[PDB]
Structures are given as C-alpha cells and as structure tokens.
Amino acid sequence: GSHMQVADLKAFSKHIYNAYLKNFNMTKKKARSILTGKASHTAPFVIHDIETLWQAEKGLVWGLPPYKEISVHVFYRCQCTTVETVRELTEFAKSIPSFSSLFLNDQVTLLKYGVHEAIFAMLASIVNKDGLLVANGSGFVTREFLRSLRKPFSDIIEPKFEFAVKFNALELDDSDLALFIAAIILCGDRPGLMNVPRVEAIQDTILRALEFHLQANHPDAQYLFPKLLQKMADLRQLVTEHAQMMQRIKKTETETSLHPLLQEIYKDMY
Ligand SMILES: Cc1cc(SCc2sc(-c3ccc(C(F)(F)F)c(F)c3)nc2C)ccc1OCC(=O)O
C-alpha cells in the first residue's frame, strides 16, 4: 500500500531535519545560545536608537540603495534579510523528499506563496519580547527602536513580535521546526497548482510525521499538535495583512524601492 507506517514517518522526519540543518545558518539552537548568553562570544551589539544604528552601519559586519532616511534604510535591511532567507528556504525545499519530483511550475508556485509564512515562523527563533537578532546574530535591534520608525514602517514589524512571543511559548526546537516549515511549504492550498492531490498527499505525510514527532519529543505537552495547526492558520492571516501593508508602501512611498525578487513574489496579489 501507500500508507506509511510509524517507522517510515520517523525516517521521513530525520531526512527533513537533516535538510534543515544543511540549509539554515541560523538555527533556533544557535539563536537561543546568543539570546540567553550561553554563547562564548560577548553579547551582541545593541541597536536601540539613531546613534547605535549609525555605529552599527560603520562597525557591524553585514549593496543597499542610497540612503534617504532612517525608516527607509531599515526597510531595505528588512528586504535584504528576507532575500537571504528566501534563498535558504529554496535550498531547504529542494532537499525535502518528494519536492524536487513535483512539476517545476508547482515547485515555483509553492515557494512563491509559501516563503513569507515560513519566514515569519522562523523569525520567532531569533526574536524575544524585547527585540530580534541581526547581522547573523552579532547585532540585536530593539522592539522599541522599530516602534520609533515613522509610519507606515513602524506598523510592519510589531505584528511579527506579537506572533513570535506566543509562538515561542510553545517551546519548539529545531527538529520540530524542520517539519513545521516543510508543512508550510508543501501546502496544497496554494493558487495555480497543477497537481493538487500530489501536494496534499505530501503535506499530510509531513503533518502525520509531525504529530508522532511531537509525541516523542514533547511527551508531556497538551494539545501541541492542534495548537500548531492553528498557528499555521494564524500565519496565513499574518501574511495577508503584511502584503496589504507592503502594497500601501508601494503606492504611497514612491521613493522607496523594492527588491526585484520580492517584487515578483508580490507581483500577482494586487
Ligand atoms: C519590511 C519587511 C518586514 C518584515 S518583518 C521581519 C523582519 S524585521 C528585520 C530587520 C529589522 C531591522 C533591522 C535593522 F534595523 F537593520 F537592524 C534588520 F536588520 C532586520 N528583518 C526581518 C525579516 C519582513 C519582510 C519585510 O519586507 C520584505 C518582504 O515582505 O518580503
């Protein structure tokens, strides 16, 4: 038959975890070691105002468009970060069993409508209630500083903190997140898919693997699997809202540029 047993699902999970470790430089384990002070290096440089942002741009190890103003500059660094994670997600996807065998067009479609949900999920790993890590972990920008940016740029990031804090309360590790992100990517609900049943099948397999994985890895947790399915739904709404805010910037901040790679992702949604 075609219905995988527990042993098959466990092996499937291990392969996805390996593809994860292979393709992501900033894992939650690494991020947490930095954020909890376990790292052997000194605490990250803190960006909490204009003076420190300027200093970080001069002393922190990171081709942006010409400087215009603080809020727009930060907007550009958001884009750059996003582009890098998109490249990692693409390589991660290619390494997930049964992704590379989908129609090329379906692979493209899945990444296009999937990357942002995945980005916001993984973002939680490098975030706490007070800020997030930048410059590959060597910097830390405060939530308060991002709130100080002028509208509409301040309105973009705050929603992600709200989501991340609650998401982090679930206490997932990298092994869990590997399956979660795979499930987000291999999503049979995306528009323009040629072979929906194939994608549906793969997603369901990933989800079953995830349930069994959570059982062993978090034996004492309650309703963790259902909670994560809800998180997936929450991410869809987060992205819709984020895309709306990006469109507003596109129409009102005509002096602000958008990376071509991100332009295509958002191309056919407005
Ligand atoms: C505008 C925008 C915001 C987000 S919210 C998640 C954030 S915040 C962030 C960041 C914030 C401040 C700095 C600073 F100050 F420079 F240190 C920094 F380096 C990095 N990086 C990310 C991923 C996500 C995407 C996006 O546009 C691109 C798209 O939608 O594709």
Numbering used by the authors: 167 to 228, 234 to 441
Quoted from the paper:
There are three peroxisome proliferator activated receptor (PPAR) subtypes termed PPARβ/δ (hereafter δ), PPARα and PPARγ with different expression profiles and actions. PPARδ activation improves overall metabolic profile. PPAR C-terminal ligand binding domains (LBDs) are 60–70% homologous with large (≈1300Å3) Y-shaped ligand binding pockets (LBPs) composed of three sub-arms (Arms I, II and III) that display significant homology between the subtypes. GW0742 was developed using standard medicinal chemistry and conforms to the pharmacophoric model of PPAR ligands, yet displays 300–1,000 fold selectivity for PPARδ versus other PPARs and full PPARδ agonist actions in cell culture and animal models.
The crystal structure of hPPARδ-LBD with GW0742 was determined in the P212121 space group, at 1.95 Å resolution. The final model consists of a monomer in the asymmetric unit, composed of residues Gln171 to Tyr441 (hPPARδ numbering). GW0742 occupied the Y-shaped LBP and adopted a position predicted by the pharmacophoric model of PPAR ligands. The hydrophilic head group interacts with arm I and the hydrophobic tail, comprising the thiazole and the fluorine substituted phenyl ring, is positioned mostly in arm II. In total, GW0742 made 29 ligand interactions with PPARδ pocket, including three polar interactions and 26 apolar interactions. By analogy, these interactions are probably responsible for maintaining the locked agonist conformation of activation helix 12. One ligand carboxylate oxygen engages in hydrogen bonds with the side chains of residues His413 (helix 10/11) and Tyr437 (helix 12) - Figure 2B. The other carboxylate oxygen contacts the His287 side chain from PPARδ helix 7. More interestingly, the GW0742 hydrophobic tail occupies the entrance to Arm II, unlike GW735 and Rosiglitazone tails which are directed towards Arm III between the helices 3 and 2̀. Comparison of amino acids that form the PPARδ Arm II entrance with equivalent regions of PPARα and PPARγ revealed two substitutions which could potentially form barriers to GW0742 binding and could block access to PPARγ and PPARα Arm II; δVal312 is replaced by bulkier side chains αIle339 and γMet376 and δIle328 is substituted by the bulkier methionine in both PPARs (αMet355 and γMet392). Thus, the presence of bulky residues at positions 312 and 328 reduces PPARδ activation by GW0742 but does not permit PPARδ activation by ligands that bind other subtypes.
